[PDB]
Structure formats: structure tokens, C-alpha cells
Amino acid sequence: MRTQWPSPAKLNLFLYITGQRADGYHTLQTLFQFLDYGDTISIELRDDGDIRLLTPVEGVEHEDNLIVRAARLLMKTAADSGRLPTGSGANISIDKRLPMGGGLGGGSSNAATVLVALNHLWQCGLSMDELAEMGLTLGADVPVFVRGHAAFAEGVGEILTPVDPPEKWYLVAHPGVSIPTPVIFKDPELPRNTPKRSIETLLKCEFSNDCEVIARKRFREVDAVLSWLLEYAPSRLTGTGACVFAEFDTESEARQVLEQAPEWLNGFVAKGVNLSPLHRAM
Amino acid sequence: MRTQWPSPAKLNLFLYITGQRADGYHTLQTLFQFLDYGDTISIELRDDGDIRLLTPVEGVEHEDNLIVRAARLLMKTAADSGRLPTGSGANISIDKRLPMGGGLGGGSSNAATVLVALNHLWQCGLSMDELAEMGLTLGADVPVFVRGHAAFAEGVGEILTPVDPPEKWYLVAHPGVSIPTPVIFKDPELPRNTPKRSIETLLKCEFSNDCEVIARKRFREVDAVLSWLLEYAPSRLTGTGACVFAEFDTESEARQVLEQAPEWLNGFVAKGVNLSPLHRAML
Ligand SMILES: Nc1ncnc2c1ncn2[C@@H]1O[C@H](COP(=O)(O)OP(=O)(O)O)[C@@H](O)[C@H]1O
Numbered sequence: 001m002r003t004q005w006p007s008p009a010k011l012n013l014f015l016y017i018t019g020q021r022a023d024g025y026h027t028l029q030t031l032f033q034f035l036d037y038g039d040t041i042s043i044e045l046r047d048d049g050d051i052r053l054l055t056p057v058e059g060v061e062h063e064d065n066l067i068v069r070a071a072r073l074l075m076k077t078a079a080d081s082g083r084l085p086t087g088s089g090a091n092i093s094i095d096k097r098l099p100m101g102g103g104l105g106g107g108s109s110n111a112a113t114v115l116v117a118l119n120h121l122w123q124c125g126l127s128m129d130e131l132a133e134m135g136l137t138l139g140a141d142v143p144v145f146v147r148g149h150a151a152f153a154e155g156v157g158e159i160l161t162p163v164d165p166p167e168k169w170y171l172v173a174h175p176g177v178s179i180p181t182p183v184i185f186k187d188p189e190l191p192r193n194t195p196k197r198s199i200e201t202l203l204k205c206e207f208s209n210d211c212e213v214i215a216r217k218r219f220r221e222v223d224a225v226l227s228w229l230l231e232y233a234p235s236r237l238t239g240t241g242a243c244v245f246a247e248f249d250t251e252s253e254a255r256q257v258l259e260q261a262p263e264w265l266n267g268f269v270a271k272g273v274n275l276s277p278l279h280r281a282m
Numbered sequence: 283m284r285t286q287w288p289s290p291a292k293l294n295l296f297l298y299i300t301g302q303r304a305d306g307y308h309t310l311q312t313l314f315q316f317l318d319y320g321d322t323i324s325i326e327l328r329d330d331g332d333i334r335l336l337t338p339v340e341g342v343e344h345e346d347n348l349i350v351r352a353a354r355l356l357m358k359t360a361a362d363s364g365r366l367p368t369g370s371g372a373n374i375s376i377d378k379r380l381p382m383g384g385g386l387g388g389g390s391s392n393a394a395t396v397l398v399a400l401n402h403l404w405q406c407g408l409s410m411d412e413l414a415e416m417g418l419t420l421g422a423d424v425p426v427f428v429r430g431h432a433a434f435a436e437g438v439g440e441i442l443t444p445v446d447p448p449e450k451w452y453l454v455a456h457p458g459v460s461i462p463t464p465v466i467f468k469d470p471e472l473p474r475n476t477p478k479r480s481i482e483t484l485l486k487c488e489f490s491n492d493c494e495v496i497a498r499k500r501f502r503e504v505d506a507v508l509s510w511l512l513e514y515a516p517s518r519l520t521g522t523g524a525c526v527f528a529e530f531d532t533e534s535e536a537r538q539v540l541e542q543a544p545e546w547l548n549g550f551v552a553k554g555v556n557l558s559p560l561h562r563a564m565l
């Protein structure tokens with residue numbers, strides 16, 4: 001039989017870069033909230049051990065797809081501890097709505113959703129801790145999606161504390177430019193020394209994204225989108241860009257501004273949700 | 283009173299790059315063993331809450347030193363979970379023998395030793411898991427040093443399985459070139475698709491380091507050292523370089539080859555040990 005599984009977007013409501021190790025990896029303090037909007041993943045079980053992604057994702061080959069990578073990692077990890085019933089396989093299809101990149105975390109969401117879904121359908125019986133561990137090897141943000149709650153992330157992205165930030169409505173704009181994450185993280189002007197602070201401190205401070213000053217400066221398209229939206233509401237970069245979000249108390253106000261937006265904002269409106277649509281449909 | 287604390291070197295006996303995430307981070311499968319050789323960190327407790335590093339490290343600012351970063355992170359973490367006695371502080375001095383970088387893990391080791399030593403001396407009682415967690419925020423290799431045993435490391439460097447590889451003797455050479463880790467990791471020709479395999483598979487395969495082919499080609503001083511050493515013994519890059527190690531069954535044979543070595547090898551000899559000298563001193 002066929003099952004459907006949400007793969008929501010996220011926003012980083014705040015993102016602080018606390019340090020960079022000698023190998024180049026940046027430590028962060030960041031707050032994740034889900035959008036009630038995203039991809040939908042359909043799965044049909046197989047009993048011949050095969051994994052198939054039936055829907056190509058534009059510009060990614062089958063075996064590099066995070067969906068396939070996640071399913072094969074789960075398969076291999078389970079099998080190595082005798083947790084994988086013989087024949088365990090799946091046909092996987094994605095209704096893909098989230099942009100590629102943008103800082104909405106679509107790739108990580110897809111991998112989280114696949115691990116959680118297949119763990120359940122194959123009855124591998126892995127813990128959420130185990131799924132989150134494994135997921136972190138595939139994408140920086142997979143653990144927040146696997147665990148399913150709005151969360152303050154630190155450590156190397158593995159330390160997650162649930163929080164319940166305001167479930168606002170957002171106008172999420174996608175400036176017409178591609179920003180690969182390394183492009184921002186290699187920038188010499190990137191802040192990399194924001195003081196580590198408590199969740200109690202951060203939650204009461206003004207929210208900002210340390211990547212924003214850089215993305216705005218290097219990419220005119222982000223500067224244009226941000227300038228346009230700040231005339232209406234507090235608006236920030238999510239992830240390492242390019243996407244930018246404007247916060248509103250109600251759907252009507254968000255959509256009021258959307259209807260005034262130029263086409264080049266490539267905007268949509270969605271509500272922040274603290275429990276993931278994945279886990280909710282569970 | 284003054285206590286002394288080993289901060290040993292490591293070698294990666296093998297290092298496989300299994301993948302790279304969208305954010306640029308590379309996942310690895312690698313085997314660590316310690317050297318019975320390294321830095322020594324001396325600590326004197328303070329009761330006024332200060333942290334001082336009395337010995338500056340070449341080219342590294344006080345507050346950018348991983349010794350200071352690690353001491354301050356523990357203090358904050360203990361204080362906020364109510365596990366730091368009032369006034370806990372320390373004077374810290376390092377007898378620094380390890381090169382800067384080189385793939386011997388000196389910075390990570392210094393940070394691990396500080397965490398372990400100050401956790402013990404201030405009586406905070408943080409677990410090894412907590413100390414390894416904290417440590418991984420400071421350096422990629424801190425967890426192996428905190429947990430104190432030769433180990434197979436995977437995950438994002440947090441998943442450590444004890445292993446007992448052969449305690450060989452090594453001639454460790456330092457080609458005369460600086461290799462920042464990011465330069466190797468950003469290279470387009472670096473392997474990033476080595477199949478993730480089981481520890482049993484790995485332990486019974488030929489050992490290699492996926493970074494070596496890049497380091498050799500970009501920095502021919504590394505190519506020189508490797509070529510010279512490979513005439514005498516199996517030899518490989520450690521970490522992302524520049525250091526290269528050659529393995530030997532005995533100290534005599536290793537020092538015999540050292541004796542013949544040209545000056546530009548900048549070599550020393552040390553024995554691999556599976557229990558960290560830090561943890562051995564604490565027995
Ligand atoms: N199913 C997938 N969805 C999105 N990106 C994918 C997928 N599979 C592989 N990728 C690759 O990995 C990157 C992930 O980017 P993104 O969609 O923002 O996800 P995330 O930010 O969660 O990693 C993309 O650049 C893309 O080339």
C-alpha cells in the first residue's frame with residue numbers, strides 16, 4: 001500500500017556563529033521553526049530489497065539524491081545490527097515544492113522524512129536519537145526535522161532543546177539568485193565570534209541572522225528583496241540565503257503584503273508551526 | 283599545588299572520506315592511535331575565578347588559544363549546571379613540542395587535556411560524554427583525546443569505537459610546508475565517495491588516507507618525504523598533512539632509518555600507544 005509523508009520547510013528564526021574550528025567547521029547557535037508548507041513524499045514498500053526514487057529532482061542524479069542516500073544509509077545501518085527484515089525495500093516519490101537551496105532546508109527535510117518514514121514502515125525500530133545521529137551525517141539540519149519540534153540547536157548541530165517560539169505567519173521570498181552555503185561560510189567578513197549565550201538570553205533578544213550582512217552585500221538580489229520587505233515588517237535571511245522572510249501576526253496581513261509584492265519576490269505565505277507536519281501526521 | 287598532564291599526539295592510521303554535506307562538512311571514517319609523545323600542560327589552581335595561560339603559543343592570541351577556549355567553556359558549562367565550586371580558576375602553562383597543524387592533532391589534544399584535567403581538579407564531575415560533546419565544538423579530534431583510547435571514529439566525529447591496532451614504532455616526518463586543512467578539503471579532486479564500510483572490513487583492509495593523493499600533488503615537499511620513506515617502510519599522510527609517518531616493528535629499526543634521513547625530513551621517532559598517556563597518568 002501507499003503512504004504519504006510531509007517534508008516541511010524550516011526557517012532559522014535566529015542564527016549566531018559562535019566559532020570556527022581548525023578544520024573549517026563553524027559552530028552555531030540557531031533557532032528552528034517549521035513551516036506548514038513543503039514537499040510530500042509517497043512511499044510504496046517493496047519486498048525485493050530494492051530502493052527506487054521514481055521522481056528525479058532537477059539537477060541531482062539518483063544516487064546523490066538525499067532521498068536515496070538516506071534510504072540506503074538506513075538500510076545499511078539496520079542490516080549491520082540485524083535490524084532489517086529481509087526484502088526490505090521501497091519505491092519513493094516526491095512532490096517537490098521547496099526551492100533547491102534558499103535556506104528553507106528542503107534537502108535535510110527530505111532526508112529526515114525518509115529516515116523516519118522508512119524506519120517506521122520497515123520496522124527497523126531505531127530510536128529518534130539513532131535516527132538523528134545518522135541524519136546528521138547527511139545534512140546539517142536533519143536532526144531538527146527527525147526530532148520534530150521547534151528547537152534551539154547548538155554543539156555541532158546535535159544538541160537540540162525544544163522551544164515554542166511565536167507561530168507567526170510568514171511571507172517567504174526567494175530572491176532570484178543561487179547561494180551555495182560554502183560561498184557564505186568562506187567569506188572573510190562573515191561574523192565568527194558572536195558570544196555563546198543562553199536560550200533564556202537569546203529568546204529575549206532581538207533576533208538576527210549573522211549571515212545576513214554578508215548575503216545582502218554580496219548579492220544585490222537579496223538586498224533588493226530585503227529592502228522591499230522591511231518597509232512592511234521585520235524581515236530576515238533564513239539559513240545562508242537566498243530566502244528572506246517577513247513576519248506577520250495574521251494570514252490576512254501577510255497576504256495583503258504578498259498581493260502588493262512584485263513578481264520578483266517569488267513569494268508565498270505560510271504559518272510557522274512548532275510541531276512538525278511530519279510528526280503531526282503521526 | 284602544581285600538577286602535570288600529558289597532551290599526546292595522534293596519527294590517523296587510516297582516513298576515508300565518505301561524503302560531503304550541502305554545508306561543506308565532510309564525513310569521515312578514520313582510525314586514531316596515540317603517540318607516546320607530545321605536549322605537557324602544567325596547572326596551578328586559583329581561587330579567585332581567573333583563567334590565565336602563562337605560556338603564549340606561537341602566532342595564537344590568548345583568547346583564541348584552544349587551552350583558554352576549553353578552560354572557559356568548561357567553567358561556563360559547570361557554572362550554569364551548578365557544578366563549579368565558587369572561585370574555581372587556574373594558571374595554565376604549556377610545554378609545547380607538537381608542530382602547529384601537521385596532522386598530529388596538537389590543538390585538539392591540548393583542548394582535551396585541559397577539559398579532562400580541569401574537570402578533575404575543580405571537581406565538576408562532568409561525564410566523558412559531556413566532555414567529548416563540549417570538546418567537539420572546539421576541535422574535530424577532541425573526542426578521541428577526551429575518551430582516551432585508540433578508536434575508530436565516524437558520525438560527525440562523535441561516534442567512537444575502541445580498537446586496539448598494532449602499537450608500532452613510527453618515524454614521523456614533517457615536510458617543510460604549511461597545509462591549512464581547508465585547502466585540502468576544498469580541493470575538487472579530493473575523494474568524497476569512499477564507501478562507508480564496517481569496522482571489521484576496515485581493520486582487515488589495506489590502510490590508506492584519502493587526503494594523501496591531494497597533499498602529495500599540491501605540495502611536492504610532502505611528495506618528497508613520502509617517496510624517501512616509502513623506500514624503507516609503509517608510509518602515509520596523517521590528518522590532512524603535512525606530516526607523514528613510516529611504521530616499524532622496533533625502535534631500533536625506526537631510529538636506524540632516522541639516522542640515514544636527510545635534514546629536510548624534520549623527523550622524530552615515537553611509539554604508538556592505544557591507551558592515551560593522559561589517561562595512563564590518571565590511573
Ligand atoms: N531531494 C533533494 N532536495 C533538495 N536538494 C537535494 C536533494 N537531493 C540532493 N540535493 C542536493 O543537496 C543540496 C541541498 O540543498 P537544500 O535543498 O537547501 O537542502 P538543505 O538546505 O536541507 O541541505 C542541493 O544543493 C542539492 O543539489
Ligand SMILES: Nc1ncnc2c1ncn2[C@@H]1O[C@H](COP(=O)(O)OP(=O)(O)O)[C@@H](O)[C@H]1O
Pocket residue numbers: 022339341342346347348349381382383384385386387388389390391392421423
Ligand atoms: N594551543 C594550541 N596548540 C596548537 N594549535 C592551536 C592552539 N590554539 C589554537 N590553535 C590553532 O589550531 C590550529 C593548529 O592545529 P593543530 O596544532 O594541528 O591542532 P588541531 O589541528 O588538533 O587543532 C592553528 O590554526 C592554530 O592557530
